[PDB]
From a paper:
Human cellular retinol binding protein II (hCRBPII) was used as a protein engineering platform to rationally regulate absorptive and emissive properties of a covalently bound fluorogenic dye. We demonstrate the binding of a thio-dapoxyl analog via formation of a protonated imine between an active site lysine residue and the chromophore’s aldehyde. Previously, we showed the utility of human cellular retinol-binding protein II (hCRBPII) mutants as a fluorophoric tag, wherein an active site lysine residue (Q108K) reacts with synthetic aldehydic chromophores, giving rise to the formation of either an imine (Schiff base, SB) or an iminium (protonated SB, PSB). Q108K functions as the active-site lysine and forms a Schiff base with the aldehyde, whereas the K40L mutation is assumed to eliminate interactions between Q108K and Lys40, an interaction that could otherwise impede imine formation, and is also required to promote Schiff base protonation.
Gratifyingly, the red shifting properties of T51V and T53S to M1 were additive, resulting in 47 and 23 nm, absorption and emission red shifts, respectively (M8). Thus, the M8 template (Q108 K:K40L:T51V:T53S) was retained for further protein engineering. We first focused on the Arg58 position, introducing aromatic residues (M9-M12) to the parent tetramutant M8. However, results were disappointing with most mutations resulting in modest hypsochromic wavelength shifts. Nonetheless, we were able to successfully obtain a crystal structure of M11, which guided further engineering efforts. The tryptophan at position 58 does not sequester the binding pocket; instead, it flips inside, where it makes a cation - π interaction with the diethyl-amino group of TD-1V (3.7 Å). Additionally, comparison of the M10 and M11 structures shows that introduction of Trp58 results in an almost 90° rotation of the entire chromophore, altering the position and therefore interactions of the imine at the opposite end. A conserved water network connecting the hydroxyl group of Tyr19 and the thiophene sulfur atom of TD-1V was observed in the M11 crystal structure. The explanation for why only the combination of Y19W with R58W led to the significant change in spectral shift as opposed to the combination of R58H and Y19W is probably due to the nearly 90° rotation of the chromophore trajectory enforced by its interaction with Trp58 for M11.
Residue numbers in the entry: 1 to 133
The structure:
């Protein structure tokens, strides 16, 4: 389904280290971040999204409209400028972050009571699964 509204708690986290390493996040930041469970919070109305990502170590929010390109500065992730665009492919929400890194972005979708997130950068894929609280 396309409805991603909700509060979502991490159930699983695969290869978050590979993705962060791919983004050139410094070793000491990675080593702590890879160990952590994350939470996502998502308000979606029409094509308007507000999303918040949290752990004990960080707390980030981003707002975007489906189909409207926007500049991003990924401050206190890897600190780069990208041009982001979020669109639908069927019921999969796809973000491309155009910039220095190839294959950078993410895909998000719902299966049952769960939210699936694929984070990509270069040749690394990170998969996370969240349950609807």
């Amino acid at each position: 389904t396309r409805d991603q509204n909700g509060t979502w708690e991490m159930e699983s986290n695969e290869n978050f280290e590979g993705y962060m390493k791919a983004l050139d996040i410094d070793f000491a930041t990675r080593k702590i971040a890879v160990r952590l469970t994350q939470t996502l919070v998502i308000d979606q109305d029409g094509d308007n999204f507000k999303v918040k990502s949290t752990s004990t170590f960080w707390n980030y929010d981003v707002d975007f409209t489906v189909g409207v390109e926007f500049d991003e500065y990924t401050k206190s992730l890897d600190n780069r400028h990208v041009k982001a665009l979020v669109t639908w492919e069927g019921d999969v929400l796809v973000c491309v972050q155009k910039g220095e890194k190839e294959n950078r972005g993410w895909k998000k979708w719902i299966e049952g009571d769960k939210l699936y997130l694929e984070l990509t950068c270069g040749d690394q894929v990170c998969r996370q699964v969240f349950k609807k609280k």
